[PDB]
Amino acid sequence: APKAKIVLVGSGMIGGVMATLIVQKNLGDVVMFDIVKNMPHGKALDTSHTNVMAYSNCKVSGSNTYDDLKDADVVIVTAGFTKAPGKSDKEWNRDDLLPLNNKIMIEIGGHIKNNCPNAFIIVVTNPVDVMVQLLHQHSGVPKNKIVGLGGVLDTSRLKYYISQKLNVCPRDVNAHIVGAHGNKMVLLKRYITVGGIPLQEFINNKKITDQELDAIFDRTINTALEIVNLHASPYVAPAAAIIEMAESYIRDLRKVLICSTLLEGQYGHKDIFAGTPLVIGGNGVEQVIELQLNADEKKKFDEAVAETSRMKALI
Amino acid sequence: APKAKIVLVGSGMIGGVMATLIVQKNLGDVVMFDIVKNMPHGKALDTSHTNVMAYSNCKVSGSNTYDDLKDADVVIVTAGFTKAPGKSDKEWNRDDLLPLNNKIMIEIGGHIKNNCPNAFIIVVTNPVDVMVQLLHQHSGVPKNKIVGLGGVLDTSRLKYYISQKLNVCPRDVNAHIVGAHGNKMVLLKRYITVGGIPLQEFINNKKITDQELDAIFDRTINTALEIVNLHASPYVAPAAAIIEMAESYIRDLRKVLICSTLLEGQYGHKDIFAGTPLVIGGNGVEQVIELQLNADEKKKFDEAVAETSRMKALI
Amino acid sequence: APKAKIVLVGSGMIGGVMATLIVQKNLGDVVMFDIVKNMPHGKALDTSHTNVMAYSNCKVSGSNTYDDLKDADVVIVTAGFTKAPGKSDKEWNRDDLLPLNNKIMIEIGGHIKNNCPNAFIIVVTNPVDVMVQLLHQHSGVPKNKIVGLGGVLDTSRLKYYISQKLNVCPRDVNAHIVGAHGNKMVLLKRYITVGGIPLQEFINNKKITDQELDAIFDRTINTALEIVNLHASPYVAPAAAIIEMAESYIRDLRKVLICSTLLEGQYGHKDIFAGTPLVIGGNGVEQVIELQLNADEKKKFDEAVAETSRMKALI
Amino acid sequence: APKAKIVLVGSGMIGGVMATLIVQKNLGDVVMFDIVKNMPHGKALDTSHTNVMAYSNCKVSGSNTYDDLKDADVVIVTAGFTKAPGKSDKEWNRDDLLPLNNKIMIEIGGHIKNNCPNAFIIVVTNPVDVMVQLLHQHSGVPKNKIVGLGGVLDTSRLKYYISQKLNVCPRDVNAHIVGAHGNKMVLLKRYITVGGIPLQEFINNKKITDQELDAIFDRTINTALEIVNLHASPYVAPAAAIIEMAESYIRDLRKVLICSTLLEGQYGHKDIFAGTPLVIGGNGVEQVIELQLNADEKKKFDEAVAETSRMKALI
Ligand SMILES: NC(=O)c1ccc[n+]([C@@H]2O[C@H](COP(=O)([O-])OP(=O)(O)OC[C@H]3O[C@@H](n4cnc5c(N)ncnc54)[C@H](O)[C@@H]3O)[C@@H](O)[C@H]2O)c1
Ligand SMILES: NC(=O)c1ccc[n+]([C@@H]2O[C@H](COP(=O)([O-])OP(=O)(O)OC[C@H]3O[C@@H](n4cnc5c(N)ncnc54)[C@H](O)[C@@H]3O)[C@@H](O)[C@H]2O)c1
Ligand SMILES: NC(=O)c1ccc[n+]([C@@H]2O[C@H](COP(=O)([O-])OP(=O)(O)OC[C@H]3O[C@@H](n4cnc5c(N)ncnc54)[C@H](O)[C@@H]3O)[C@@H](O)[C@H]2O)c1
Ligand SMILES: NC(=O)c1ccc[n+]([C@@H]2O[C@H](COP(=O)([O-])OP(=O)(O)OC[C@H]3O[C@@H](n4cnc5c(N)ncnc54)[C@H](O)[C@@H]3O)[C@@H](O)[C@H]2O)c1
Secondary structure (H helix, E strand, O other): OOOOEEEEEOOOHHHHHHHHHHHHOOOOEEEEEOOOOOHHHHHHHHHHHHHHHHOOOOOEEEEOOHHHHOOOOEEEEOOOOOOOOOOOOOOOOHHHHOOOOHHHHHHHHHHHHHHOOOOEEEEOOOOHHHHHHHHHHHHOOOHHHEEEOOHHHHHHHHHHHHHHHHOOOHHHEEOOEEEOOOOOOEEOHHHOEEOOEEHHHHHHOOOOOHHHHHHHHHHHHOHHHHHHHHOOOOOHHHHHHHHHHHHHHHOOOOEEEEEEEEEEOHHHOEEEEEEEEEEEEOOEEEEEOOOOOOHHHHHHHHHHHHHHHHHHHOO | OOOOEEEEEOOOHHHHHHHHHHHHOOOOEEEEEOOOOOHHHHHHHHHHOHHHHOOOOOOEEEEOOHHHHOOOOEEEEOOOOOOOOOOOHHHOOHHHHHHHHHHHHHHHHHHHHHHOOOOEEEEOOOOHHHHHHHHHHHHOOOHHHEEEOOHHHHHHHHHHHHHHHHOOOHHHEEOOEEEOOOOOOEEOHHHOEEOOEEHHHHHHOOOOOHHHHHHHHHHHHHHHHHHHHHOOOOOHHHHHHHHHHHHHHHOOOOEEEEEEEEEEOHHHOEEEEEEEEEEEEOOEEEEEOOOOOOHHHHHHHHHHHHHHHHHHHOO | OOOOEEEEEOOOHHHHHHHHHHHHOOOOEEEEEOOOOOHHHHHHHHHHOHHHHOOOOOOEEEEOOHHHHOOOOEEEEOOOOOOOOOOOHHHOOHHHHHHHHHHHHHHHHHHHHHHOOOOEEEEOOOOHHHHHHHHHHHHOOOHHHEEEOOHHHHHHHHHHHHHHHHOOOHHHEEOOEEEOOOOOOEEOHHHOEEOOEEHHHHHHOOOOOHHHHHHHHHHHHHHHHHHHHHOOOOOHHHHHHHHHHHHHHHOOOOEEEEEEEEEEOHHHOEEEEEEEEEEEEOOEEEEEOOOOOOHHHHHHHHHHHHHHHHHHHOO | OOOOEEEEEOOOHHHHHHHHHHHHOOOOEEEEEOOOOOHHHHHHHHHHHHHHHHOOOOOEEEEOOHHHHOOOOEEEEOOOOOOOOOOOOOOOOHHHHOOOOHHHHHHHHHHHHHHOOOOEEEEOOOOHHHHHHHHHHHHOOOHHHEEEOOHHHHHHHHHHHHHHHHOOOHHHEEOOEEEOOOOOOEEOHHHOEEOOEEHHHHHHOOOOOHHHHHHHHHHHHOHHHHHHHHOOOOOHHHHHHHHHHHHHHHOOOOEEEEEEEEEEOHHHOEEEEEEEEEEEEOOEEEEEOOOOOOHHHHHHHHHHHHHHHHHHHOO
16 A cells, blocks of 8 residues: 655665656655765655656655655665776776775664664665675664675676577576676576577577677676776666566565575575575565586685675675 | 557457457557457447556457458457357367368458458467468468467466466566467476576475476366366467567567467478467567477477377368 | 455456456456356466466456455455346446345445455446445445545546547546436536646637537447447446556555545535545545536536435435 | 667767666667767666666667768757856856857757658757757758657646645646746646646635745746756756657657647747647647637747747847
């Protein structure tokens, strides 16, 4: 009956598109929160009018007070920095972001614990796989109520590139990128299908070659960098990805999506967050799916988790 | 710019739902044709009013003249009988339909050749794999411009049942049923994925058993009969399935869908229509996808094709 | 988070389309209830498969027990007869329906009181303005939680016909038909706009004439009869209209819709249900809007209410 | 069948949201064109991935060459400046934009005439009512194939503000703001309706007062300024508005929308563009609607057109 209340903790580039999309889908009431005075109210005022064009009925208001987290059903955290100062577009790496972004999670976690402990939480702030757990530790929310953005966005790239080469509906391509969001992303060739058919079949048929696939792989891992060098840290697709995830929770869709979640033994790991297929429903994370990886694949997973494990010690 | 013109050749149970769905999706102008006097004009009047509730702008008119096929962009043929005089609901079989519906194809084909030779055609009339080729022969349209309903409907059942057992979004289950629509339908266990993951992984995990899967199989094959025995020849899912197909042609979606199409050597067969994955886009059938079947799977394919072959001889 | 639970009390022609539309819009879980054995389980099985084609996640099950009303969020009552034994299609009149459908309301009301006292209820069963108050009396629900189908359906016809004549989007025509659903329906010329512009301006411009408008009026009033005479009691538009209403409650849309509601002094009447603009939101009927009618318009209102009053006495 | 080809001539803030929205609605293939090297390709790459999340199939590519206008079905012109240099947020006025924006139209018109003379054109660049005609003069396209952004955006504000005060679905409020986009906007109190009911009725009922309406009026005329002072020149709602207009053309919706169009006698004016209700269909502007204004209202219209007429002489 009541509309879900959605709090965008951070109203920069991603938060802007997220608000637009939420109204388009009439998904819930929106608070656009930020540290920067004024900006949020303006983005919110602008976004609010689209209610007419979209046949929607969602309030959109800006905020500068953590008090607006009260009674939140969904909280989305994009608070932080894209770049590190003194670095050039070339040297862009998500790693160099522990610097300006670690403290922010501590703060935000405190307020969440006090204002909306029953909310479902999605963390985006880089380096996500580390930040997600930090926020989880400070917010006190249950393990099934917090996830980080990753697979959905990374696979959307791989899915889309394959679809262009094969000339089919992008949604018709399925793929899995697990372990961690970042340069050690694990792309699983064996788990790629097109129209439900193993990719190998298309290679045997010479519709696509192993090399063009490898090319596509490279382009997938380095896409954020390619975009950073062309314009700025990606924000449109990140937005759609997060919202596909939020929507699955709010509408209880029970979609299978690859998100950063807490491992309790899966893949032989514990006390850390890693990307893997999950099911997002109205109870939050309904189920975590463990891919039955082979020897070589496990090795890759292990390496990505170590990269997350290493930065963790950096605080 | 102009709206597509869609002609439903047959306006019974399936035609009724198709028209409703077309207005919902603002998919194109609709002519509801039938030989029964007046009935279609009423269904059409009723349906036209939903343009208001759906924010659409599609005309819906009834017809009793083949003249209305003129300039059609899409023609959907459901004309015929759902079952067979002197027959009980328990002995229901789409095969006893050669009696009831052969001649109708010849008549309709002639008018199509005359009024809309460039239309995309979808045949539903059972037994579909035979009927579609008959309409193909008398209408004269190119092989990439005509398909029969089958896989989309059969897999929706298999996908749905599995999804109930696994507790995931039904769209997240992918599966293939090929060869023929009917009792000899080929259900390919090896081609089933959930969230892009091989079904075998969920069986290994004890999420679903081989036995439960086989039961789901029997259910899938006997679904039409189960519904006939509870109410009547199924028509809501058949309609949605057809519209998914028509929509992919009208909007140039390029979805991979399993439909009855003319085989020119694939799977070792020719001069006959059989169900297989294919791509539907703005040009019609953009590509036929031949599954690289193993020896066991090929055997079953050939048995389904043989049933189609047998009925074809009954002329 | 949880999906709304929707119970269709009656699963004939209108119930069938309602269930289809609910899946299309992923609006909630559906129970298709009826007294006819087996029929609803079949319609429900058929309908459930469309979850795949529609990217939805709504359960659809049949029922023959009032037990399934338990915890319903929305209940829609279509239970009854569409016409009347020994009567011809030409003498069709929603009034001869007191015979056919009074007692059914008492029975249903009792079970509602027992199983789902907090549900939002929509009555369709003709003659609706009488039936809705009967169900209101026996079910015990609050006045803001029960309405009858009428204005939304009647105006969709008037809006559509005008839109055809003027060549505009049907949603761009706005109009009001109040008082009662039936032959005494009050069509208010003064309250007609096109793109927010008074209809009179288009008449002054010679875009439509007074005569054409009056013809459109006769058509609007006699639409059900025209369709009965061509096919059967209308059900596709009635269904879309009901779902528009249910959707505005479930998604908290706060749309202004004309429904049958309990009058407590508005228009000079009380202790009776009559059609008038109202707002449907998450709380149910959020506000009843009383049109500031002139002397001529009031006269007509009173005549419609008197017809409802007369039939009420036939107990 | 084929997808519409849509060229965004200008890829700044508005162009960015427009591309996002087009993919969401699967409305057509997109070229994101601009003078600034690199930026466009990046925004395009980013936007392209959302195809997966949105079930869409639209190509999104960047461009720096006017050659990409070839075969365009829709061209949208946002090319230019928001601000004037040396001016503060306080002194922001759309007038001070003849400066940096006039020449741009000449250029773009030449290419349009040579690359896509059959396209439908929407102009946004401020001051729109002047720029639209300039572009019309240089492009040579027919009067029914070119319009400027105005009413839709300005009314969305008025509609939304009224809806908040009255607590109804924003789409349920209808209003007209004609003459010119800018500080002399003509807000027509007499043409405001809520749920199709004259606003006066709600004032008589004391649901809203004349003063709060006047307040709302002020806020409507100064909204861009309020947003400019809070963040930046509005871009989200502008985007949705333009796209509602584009969509009506591509899907042949025949919606009634207030856009800047060429007057040939209407309201007693000629050889100039002014905002007024129009119908946008697949032939472009199907009809221009002349509001039958009264003496006071005409005076206001005349004043807004003079403001457009004055700036025209400024070149
Ligand atoms: N997980 C992923 O796949 C992925 C993808 C893209 C970006 N990201 C990350 O997401 C984050 C957001 O990116 P963006 O494009 O929105 O950048 P952005 O700079 O445009 O927006 C971030 C906003 O956070 C605000 N902020 C700072 N402290 C805050 C506080 N504690 N509370 C609320 N807001 C606060 C800043 O004002 C800033 O506007 C970045 O750190 C980026 O690295 C992650
Ligand atoms: N392909 C599939 O997977 C599948 C699934 C379900 C049903 N079907 C088949 O589709 C057919 C139609 O099903 P339905 O439920 O709509 O049946 P229906 O009986 O309700 O409708 C059939 C309509 O065709 C009409 N008709 C007869 N001859 C005609 C002619 N020459 N031109 C136009 N109309 C004519 C009948 O009057 C009737 O209205 C049946 O044969 C059924 O077996 C196929
Ligand atoms: N409000 C309106 O504007 C409007 C418009 C059209 C029709 N109607 C009315 O709605 C009613 C239903 O229309 P329909 O076309 O779906 O009719 P229908 O005959 O196809 O369906 C009515 C169903 O109710 C069932 N039924 C009988 N008693 C029942 C009970 N106690 N509990 C549950 N089900 C029971 C019947 O078996 C049947 O399936 C009719 O009275 C019709 O006049 C109203
Ligand atoms: N009509 C309205 O209701 C309305 C509302 C808002 C904004 N606007 C106007 O729309 C225009 C666009 O606003 P914006 O927010 O997109 O600003 P923006 O600066 O972010 O985008 C404009 C882009 O035009 C580009 N450009 C310059 N010359 C070009 C050329 N000839 N070809 C292609 N691109 C070129 C610039 O690189 C710039 O990025 C502004 O002039 C603004 O005043 C009108």
